[PDB]
Amino acid sequence: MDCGKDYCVKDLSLAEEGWKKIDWVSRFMPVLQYIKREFEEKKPFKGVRIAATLHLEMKTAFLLLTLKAGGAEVSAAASNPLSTQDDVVAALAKAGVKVYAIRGESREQYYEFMHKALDIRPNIIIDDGADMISLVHKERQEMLDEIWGGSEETTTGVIRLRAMEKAGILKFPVIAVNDSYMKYLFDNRYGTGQSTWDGIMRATNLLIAGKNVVVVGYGWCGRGIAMRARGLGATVIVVEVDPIKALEARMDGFLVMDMKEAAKIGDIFVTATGNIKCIRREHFELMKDGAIMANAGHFDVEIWKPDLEKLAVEINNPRPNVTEYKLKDGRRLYLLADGRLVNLVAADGHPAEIMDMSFALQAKAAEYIKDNHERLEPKVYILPREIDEMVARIKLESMGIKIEELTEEQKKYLESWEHGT
Amino acid sequence: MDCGKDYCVKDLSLAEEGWKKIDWVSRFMPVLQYIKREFEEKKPFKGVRIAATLHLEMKTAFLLLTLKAGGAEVSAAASNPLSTQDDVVAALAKAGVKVYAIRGESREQYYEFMHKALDIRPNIIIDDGADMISLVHKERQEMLDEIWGGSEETTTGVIRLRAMEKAGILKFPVIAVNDSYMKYLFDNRYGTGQSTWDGIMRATNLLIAGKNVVVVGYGWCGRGIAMRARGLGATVIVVEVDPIKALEARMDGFLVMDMKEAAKIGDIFVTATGNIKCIRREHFELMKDGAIMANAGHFDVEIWKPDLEKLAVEINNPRPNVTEYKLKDGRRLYLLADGRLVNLVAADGHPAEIMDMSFALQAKAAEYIKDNHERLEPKVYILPREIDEMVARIKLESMGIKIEELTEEQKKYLESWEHGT
Amino acid sequence: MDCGKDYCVKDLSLAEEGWKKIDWVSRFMPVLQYIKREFEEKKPFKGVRIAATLHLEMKTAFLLLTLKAGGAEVSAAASNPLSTQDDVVAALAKAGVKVYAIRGESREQYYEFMHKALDIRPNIIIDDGADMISLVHKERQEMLDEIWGGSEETTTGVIRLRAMEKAGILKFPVIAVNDSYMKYLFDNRYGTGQSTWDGIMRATNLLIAGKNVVVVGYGWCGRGIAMRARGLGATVIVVEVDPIKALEARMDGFLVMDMKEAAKIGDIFVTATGNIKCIRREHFELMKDGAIMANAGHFDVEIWKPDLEKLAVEINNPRPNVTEYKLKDGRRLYLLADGRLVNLVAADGHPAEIMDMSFALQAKAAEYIKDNHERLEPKVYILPREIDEMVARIKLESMGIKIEELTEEQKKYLESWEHGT
Amino acid sequence: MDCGKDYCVKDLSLAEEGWKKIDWVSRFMPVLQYIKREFEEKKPFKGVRIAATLHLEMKTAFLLLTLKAGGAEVSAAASNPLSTQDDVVAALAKAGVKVYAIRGESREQYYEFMHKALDIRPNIIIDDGADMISLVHKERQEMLDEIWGGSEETTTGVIRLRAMEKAGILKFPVIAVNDSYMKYLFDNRYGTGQSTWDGIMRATNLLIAGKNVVVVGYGWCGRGIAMRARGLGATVIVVEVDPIKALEARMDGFLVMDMKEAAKIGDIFVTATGNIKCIRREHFELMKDGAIMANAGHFDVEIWKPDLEKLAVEINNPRPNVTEYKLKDGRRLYLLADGRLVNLVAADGHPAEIMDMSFALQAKAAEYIKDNHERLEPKVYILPREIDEMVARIKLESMGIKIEELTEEQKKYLESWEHGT
Ligand SMILES: NC(=O)c1ccc[n+]([C@@H]2O[C@H](COP(=O)([O-])OP(=O)(O)OC[C@H]3O[C@@H](n4cnc5c(N)ncnc54)[C@H](O)[C@@H]3O)[C@@H](O)[C@H]2O)c1
Ligand SMILES: NC(=O)c1ccc[n+]([C@@H]2O[C@H](COP(=O)([O-])OP(=O)(O)OC[C@H]3O[C@@H](n4cnc5c(N)ncnc54)[C@H](O)[C@@H]3O)[C@@H](O)[C@H]2O)c1
Ligand SMILES: NC(=O)c1ccc[n+]([C@@H]2O[C@H](COP(=O)([O-])OP(=O)(O)OC[C@H]3O[C@@H](n4cnc5c(N)ncnc54)[C@H](O)[C@@H]3O)[C@@H](O)[C@H]2O)c1
Ligand SMILES: NC(=O)c1ccc[n+]([C@@H]2O[C@H](COP(=O)([O-])OP(=O)(O)OC[C@H]3O[C@@H](n4cnc5c(N)ncnc54)[C@H](O)[C@@H]3O)[C@@H](O)[C@H]2O)c1
Ligand SMILES: O=c1[nH]cnc2c1ncn2[C@@H]1O[C@H](CO)[C@@H](O)[C@H]1O
Ligand SMILES: O=c1[nH]cnc2c1ncn2[C@@H]1O[C@H](CO)[C@@H](O)[C@H]1O
Ligand SMILES: O=c1[nH]cnc2c1ncn2[C@@H]1O[C@H](CO)[C@@H](O)[C@H]1O
Ligand SMILES: O=c1[nH]cnc2c1ncn2[C@@H]1O[C@H](CO)[C@@H](O)[C@H]1O
C-alpha cells in the first residue's frame, strides 16, 4: 500500500504502464476528446469538487482527467473491488486525482476508501451502482448541503435511486445517465454484448460455437449478450420473467424456457437481470458437468454463490477468474470472476469507443448539474435529448459519416393531417 | 358488378375462395380466437355499429367477423385501393358485413366507398392511415356526436391524428393502437421485415443475396426490413435523418450514408419513412440500370412518382406490380406495386400470426372505447400496458412456452434501495 | 390441349403472358445474355438437335431460346409435372421450340411427352433428374448412336448416372453440370435457400420467425435452407446421417437431433436429402397439430405420402398447394406442393440471377459435348474449372466488381518451399 | 536461464501455472482424452522418437503428453517465436518432454532450438509450417533414413511440401493433416474465426461493431474471420483474387473490392491468404488514421513490414502486441502482434475443443505413419476419411448428440438408377 491523505493505491511504480493504457484508449475516444478540448478552454469546473465511484480502468481514468482538465478537483473510489486496475490507478494518483482503490480490496476497505473519496466534500457525485449516493444519505448527512447533485451510470443504480425518491429519502437531484438513449442503446447492448464474450473467452479459452448458451434476462444487456453469442455460433436460450420480452426473444430466433429447463441443457450461463437469485440451488443441481457460469449484472447476487458453496464438497481455483465447485456426484461447475461483472473482472470492460459515448454523457451530466442545480428538485432526472443528439452527431462526424437531413417540406408534412390518399 | 345498399364488390361468386382464405389464416390466429370465444359468450358489441378502414385481406376479415360475432354491425372500406382481395371481400359481403371495396378502385371510388361505410353511422371507427377519421371531421360532421371514439392502426395515422389534436380539430377520443408494445415491436418490425421481402420476391423473382439493399428509414419498419434483408444475404445500407438511429444501424453492422450516395450503389431500394419525397428526381438520375424500388410506408408519396414520370421517355408494365420507367440514356428503373405498400399489394400482407396480435389489440381497443369513451377527452391515448401483457401471455401459452416467474423476495429486491455492495 | 406434331401445350393463347415473363427474367441474366450474343454470331449449334428435360418456367425458356439462337433445333419436356408454367410453354411453342408439357399432367403423359421430345433424334440431351437419359437407355436404344452426350443438372440425377456408369450400363458421355463449383455452391445453396422460403411463405402466409424449423439434410441445399430460415428468425434444427455434417450444423449454431426428436418439436419441416422416406409414419404420428411439411429435393419420395394417407381420416385442400391430412385424434398436418419441390411448385423456382449461372454452365456443357464428344468415353465427366472461372468473371464484371489479382511474385511464392521463418 | 541437454526454457519455476493450464484445457478435449486412454493401454509408440514443431501452449502440451503416454520419447520446438507460453513449456520440461523454446526468442535461436529438437533423431516429425521438415532436408540430411514420415498441420506447410514433392526433393512421406475434413472445416474456419477476434479484442480493447473490417482472403480461415466479424457487428469487406470465392463472399452478404479500394475505408484489416505482400506500401499510404492491422496467416509476410518501416518517421510500442507506425503526415497505423498470427500471439490460440479435433487427427497421423510408412512413397498424402468420421463420431457422442441412421432401403436407393418419376 502506497497510502497518504491524497490517495491509496497498491504501488505507485505501476504508473508508467497505467499511462500507456490511458493514452492508448483515449486515441479512440473522439467524443470525450472533443469535450476535453472544450473543458480545457472554458474551465467550467474551476473551483468545483467532484467525487466519483466508477470502475477504475483506462477509460474511467480518461473521464476523470477530462473533468480535472476542466478545472475540477477530483476524487475516486472503486465501483467494484475486483474491476480496479492497479496500474491505471497509480497513474491517476500521479496526475493528482485523489483515488483510493486497490484491486481485490475487502468490503471494509471498499467502504473506507469511498469515505476517503467523500472527504473532498464534493459538489458533484458521479456514481456507478448508487453505493456512494446511498452512503452519503446513510452515513454522511453532514455534507448533503454542499452537494449540487449526483449522476448515476447504471440500471441497478437508477432503480435504487428511483426507490429512494418514492420513499422521500432522496435529498439532492440525480441525473439518470443510464436512461439516456446514447447510453442504454449502446453501452448496455453493444458494449456488454462484446465485452461479456471477451471476458468469457479470456478466462476459459473455450469454444462458443455449438454451445447451448443460456442468457438470463432479455433487457438491453441480455439482448446484446444473446445477439453476440449467436454471432459467435452458439445456440441461444433466453430466460425471462416479462412475457413481452420473452416473445421478442422467440421472434429474434432464440429458444425461450424457464430457468429449470434451461439449467438442464445449458453449457454456458450468463445473467443480466440486475436481480437477486436468478440462478440458485435447484438450478445448480440440474446442471451438466463442466457448465460455465458468468454474471454481467452490476452486483454479484444474480448467481447465488452461498448455494454453490453448500452443494460443493471442494472449491478449487484451476485458473485465474475460474472457481470450481465440485459436487457430491463428481460434477464440476465453474463460476467466472467470482460471480462479478465478467467483462470488467476477467477482461478490460466495455470497448473504448462505447465508454467514449457513456462517459461523454457523464461529463455532460456533471456540467448539467453545475449549470442547473439551483433549479432542480431532489428527484431523478434524465438529460435533455438534445445532449444525446449532440453526442451522436460528434461521433458520426468522427466516423466520417454524413447522414440525410429533413427538408422543411418534410417537417411540415410530418406536422400535417390533411394529406391522405 | 355486385353493388347495392349493403355492399359493393367485384364478384360475389368469388366468395367460396374467400372463405377458404379466412378459414386458413384463422387456424393460426390463437389470440384472436381466444377473444372471439369471449365475444361470442358475452356479446359486448350487441347494438353497436363499427365502421372499419383496413387492408381487406383474410386476417382483416377474421377481425371483422370476430367483431360481428361479438354482436357488432360492421361496415368496411379499403385502407388502400390495391390491397383489397376481391374473394375475401365477397365472403365478407355474404357474411353480412357491409363492405365496399374493389381491388384497383380509383381514388374517387375509394372515397365514395369510404362514405358508404360511414353511412352505418358508426359508434366506433377502426382506421388504418387516418383517412376515415379525417373524412368524418372534414365531410361528415353531422354524425360526430354518434361517434364514441376511433382507433388507429399505423404510424402514419397516429402522426396525422396527433397533428389534428394539436390543431384543436379532433372531436373524439382516438386510441393509438400502433403505439402499443405488442404492435410496434412485432407488427412494425417482424411483420414488415418478412412480408416486404415476400412481396419483392413474389413480384420480381430476383435474388436478394449479394445485392446492395438500401433501406430508407431505420425506425421499427426499417430495422425489420434491414434485418431480414441481411438474413437473405443482402448487403444493407441504411439512410436516416436521425443521428441516434443512424449510429444504431452502424452498430447493427450496416453501412450508413445519405440518399445521394446510396442512390449510386443500390440495387434494391425500400422506403420505410412515413415521409414525403425520400427518393426523388436527383436520386433516380443516379441509379444503376435495372434498380428495383419499393415502398413499405403507408402512402405512395415516399418515392416521388411525378419525378420518375418526368424523367421517363417510356412507361411500360413488364409484370403485374412492376412499372418500368425507361430514361433518355436507356436506363430502366423499376417501381414495384405502383409505389404502394409492397407487402400488401404484391403479396398477402403480414403473416397470420403477426396480424393475430395487432388485431387482438384492435379488438381490445374497440372494447376500451366502448367502455371508457365517456371519461376520455378528444385526444390520442395509448392502451394500458396490461392489455399488451395479456396479449403476450395468451400467445406464449398457445406456443406452449412457460416462462420464469418472479419470487416475492425478487420483487422486494427490485423495489429496494438499501442493498448495495 | 393445343397438340400437334411439333408441340403439346395447354393453351397457345397464353403465349403473350409467357413472353413477358421470359423477357423480364432475361434482363437479369447477364451471363447467359453474354453467351447468347456469342451463340448468335457464331451459330455453334447449326444443324444440331437438342432435347431437354427441365423445369419449364421463364429462365429455362431463356436457356432454350439461347440454344435455338445458336442454331439448335430444340425439343423440351417437363422435369416435373407440376413445375411447368403453361404460359411460358405456350411462348416456347410459338418460338418454334418443340415442347410437350402441361402443368398437372399425369405420369403417363409425362412419359408420352418425354418420348415426343426424344422424337427429334437428339445429338445432345440436357436433363434434370436423369429420367430422359434413363428413358433413352431403357426404351429408346435405337438412337444411342446418334447421341453425342448428355448433361445433368441436379444432384439426384448425377447419383443415378454415376450408378449407371458403375454398373456398365451408361452408353454415352454425361457432363455432371451439378458438380461444377458455379452450380452447387450457388444454385444448390443460395438459390434453394431463398426460393424454398419464397414457396413456403407464398403457400401459407405464415410467420417464419419464432418457429422451430427442422431441416432434414445438411448438404448444399440443406445448409442454404437452414441459413435463410435463421435469417428469417426461425430456430433451426438439423437432422443428418453424416457425422461430419452434423457437427458442422452444430458449429453453425443449429440444434442437431434425430428425426423422431425433431418430429416432436418442429413447426415447419423441410427435406433436402435426395433420399427416400426421410419423414415417414412414425414421425407424422409425433408431430404437433398444424405442422407444415415441404420437400426441396428432386423427387416427391422424401416425405412419404402413402404413410400420411394411411394415417388420415380425411384429406382436404384448404389452399392451393396445401394438402391437409386430418388424423384420428383430430391433429391436422399440412403438406405443401403435394410433397414436390416446393420452390418450383408453390413459387417461381430459383431467382433469375442464380439460374443465369446454372444455365450458363448448361449452355457451355452443350457446347463442350459438341466440341468433345469424339474424344469422351461413356462416363460421367465434370466441366473443366476454367469454365467455372469464366462464368464467375463475367458475373463479377456485370456486377461492376473488380477484384485483386495475383502478382507474379505471389504466384512464385505459392510454388516455393524455401521461404520459412 | 534453465537450459541443458534435455531442454531449454525461460524458467522452470513457472511449471506449476503451466500444469494448471494443461489440466484445464484437457477437461474440454474429449476426443484426445479418448485417444490417450487407448494409447495408455496399447503403448503404440513404445521405442518411438517424435520431434514436434507446434505452437507451444497448453493444448499442444496435452497432445505431446498424450504421445508420451503412448510410449513416445518426445522433443519439441516452437512453430513461432512469439506463440510460446513459457509456463506451459516449463511444465513440459518437468514431464520429461525435450522442449526448446523461449517466448520472444530470435530467429537464430528458433533454428538452434529446432536443431536441438531434431537431435533426438526422430522417427516421426510433427510439423506446423513445414520449417522442421524443410530443415531436415536442407541441413540434417544425415538422419533422413531414420525418419519414417512427417505430418503437417497447416495450409502454408502443405503448400511448401507439395512444392518440395514437385521438385523431387521430398525424401519421406508426409501426411497433410490440414487437408482432413475434420481439420480445415473446423479449425481453419470456426477456430480461426473465434480466436482471431479474441486476440484483436484482447490486444486493443476496441469495438468491433460498426467498424469496416477488411478480410484479405476468403478461404477457410478468411470465411471464418468474416463470419465472426459480422457476428460481432462489423461491416465486412472481402478482398480476393479468386473470382469464385469473391462471388461466394458477395452472396454471403459481404462487400467485395480490391485491396486499394479496401485500404481507403477499412478500420481493421485482417490477412488470411498464406501469401506474400497482400498489404504493402501503397495500401498503407491510403489507410485512415488509427487503422488496426493483424495477420492470421502462418508467416509474418502477409502485411509487408519493411514497407511500413520505410513510411514511418517513428515506430513506438504503445501496448504489448501493438506497434505504432507514425507517418510523415501524422497518421498513426497500428500493427498487432508484430504481424504474426494474432490469435496465438495476442491470445491463447484456437479454443480447446477445436484443437481437440485437430490434434486428435495429428495423433492418428503419427500412428498412420508408424503403421504404413513402408508402403508410402516420398509424397504428400491425406488421411483416409474413415479417420475423420471416427473423430466426428467421438465428438458427437461426447456432446450427447445422437444423429439419424440410414436404413438399408435408403442405402440401396442411393446406389440405384432405376427409381425416377
Ligand atoms: N457488465 C456491464 O458492463 C453492464 C453494462 C450495463 C448494465 N449492467 C447491469 O446489467 C443489469 C441489467 O441491465 P439492463 O440495462 O439490461 O436492465 P433491463 O431492466 O433492461 O433488463 C433486465 C431484464 O431482466 C429481466 N429479469 C429480471 N429478473 C429476472 C429473472 N429472475 N429471471 C429472468 N429475467 C429476469 C427483466 O424482465 C428485464 O427484461 C443491471 O444490473 C445493470 O446495472 C452491466
Ligand atoms: N405493413 C406495412 O407495410 C407497414 C407496417 C407498419 C408500419 N408501416 C408504415 O411504415 C412507415 C414507417 O413506420 P415506422 O413505425 O417504422 O415509423 P418510425 O417513426 O418508427 O420510423 C420512421 C423513420 O424514418 C426516418 N426518416 C424520416 N424521414 C426520412 C428521410 N427523408 N430519410 C431517411 N429517414 C427518414 C425517421 O428518422 C424514423 O427513424 C409509416 O408509414 C407506417 O405507417 C407499414
Ligand atoms: N429444389 C431445388 O431447386 C433444388 C436445387 C438443387 C438440388 N436439389 C435437390 O436437393 C437434393 C439434395 O441436394 P444436395 O445438393 O443438397 O445434396 P447433398 O448430397 O449435398 O446433400 C444431401 C444431404 O442429405 C443427407 N441425408 C441423406 N439421407 C438423409 C436422411 N435420411 N436423413 C438426414 N439426412 C440425410 C446426406 O448426408 C447429405 O449431407 C437432391 O435431390 C437435389 O437434386 C433441389
Ligand atoms: N490459427 C491460425 O491463425 C490459422 C489457422 C489455420 C490456418 N492458418 C493459415 O492461414 C492461411 C490461410 O489458410 P486457409 O486454410 O484459409 O487457406 P485457403 O487456401 O483456404 O485460403 C487462402 C485464400 O487467400 C486467397 N488469396 C491469396 N493471395 C491473395 C491476395 N493477395 N489477396 C487476396 N486473397 C488472396 C486465395 O484465393 C484463397 O482463397 C495460411 O497461412 C494457413 O497456414 C492460420
Ligand atoms: O471499461 C469500463 N470502464 C468503466 N465503466 C465501464 C466499463 N465497462 C463497463 N462499464 C460500466 O459498468 C457499469 C456497470 O457497473 C455499466 O453501466 C457500464 O457503463
Ligand atoms: O395482412 C394484413 N392485413 C391487415 N393489415 C395489415 C396486414 N399487413 C400489414 N397490415 C397493417 O398495415 C398497416 C399499414 O397500413 C400496418 O400498420 C400493419 O398493421
Ligand atoms: O426456376 C427454375 N428453372 C429451372 N430450373 C430450376 C429453377 N429453380 C430451380 N431449378 C433447378 O431444379 C433442379 C432440381 O430439379 C435444381 O438442380 C435447380 O438447378
Ligand atoms: O492453441 C493452439 N495450439 C496449437 N496449434 C494451434 C492453436 N491455435 C491454432 N493452432 C494451429 O496453428 C496453425 C497455424 O500455424 C493452424 O493450422 C492451427 O491448427
Numbering used by the authors:
A (entry chain B), B (entry chain A), C (entry chain B), D (entry chain A): 1 to 421
Anything the authors wrote about it?
S-Adenosyl-l-homocysteine hydrolase (SAHH) reversibly cleaves S-adenosyl-l-homocysteine, the product of S-adenosyl-l-methionine-dependent methylation reactions. The conversion of S-adenosyl-l-homocysteine into adenosine and l-homocysteine plays an important role in the regulation of the methyl cycle. SAHH depends on the cofactor nicotinamide adenine dinucleotide in its oxidised form (NAD+), which is self-regenerated during the catalytic cycle. The protein structure of SAHHs features three domains in a monomer, the active form is usually a homotetramer.
Moreover, recombinant TmSAHH was described to only be enzymatically active after a heat-induced conformational change. To further investigate this observation, we used recombinant enzymes either previously preincubated at 95 °C or permanently handled at room temperature for crystallisation of the hyperthermophilic PfuSAHH in complex with inosine. Comparison of both structures showed no substantial differences in the conformation of the differently treated enzymes. Independent of the previous thermal treatment, PfuSAHH, as the other archaeal homologues, formed stable homotetramers in the crystal. Regarding the structures of PfuSAHH and MmaSAHH with their preferred substrates inosine or SIH, the oxygen attached to C6 seems to form additional hydrogen bonds with the carbonyl oxygen atoms of Asp348 (PfuSAHH) or Asp362 (MmaSAHH) in the main chains. This suggests that the hypoxanthine ring is in the imino-hydroxy form, although inosine has been shown to be most stable in the amino-oxo form in water. In the inosine bound complex, His298 is situated within the active site staging a His-IN conformation (gate shut) where its imidazole ring is oriented towards the γ-carboxylate group of Asp128 with a distance of 4.2 Å. The Nδ1 group of His298 is oriented to the O5´ group of inosine with a distance of 2.7 Å.
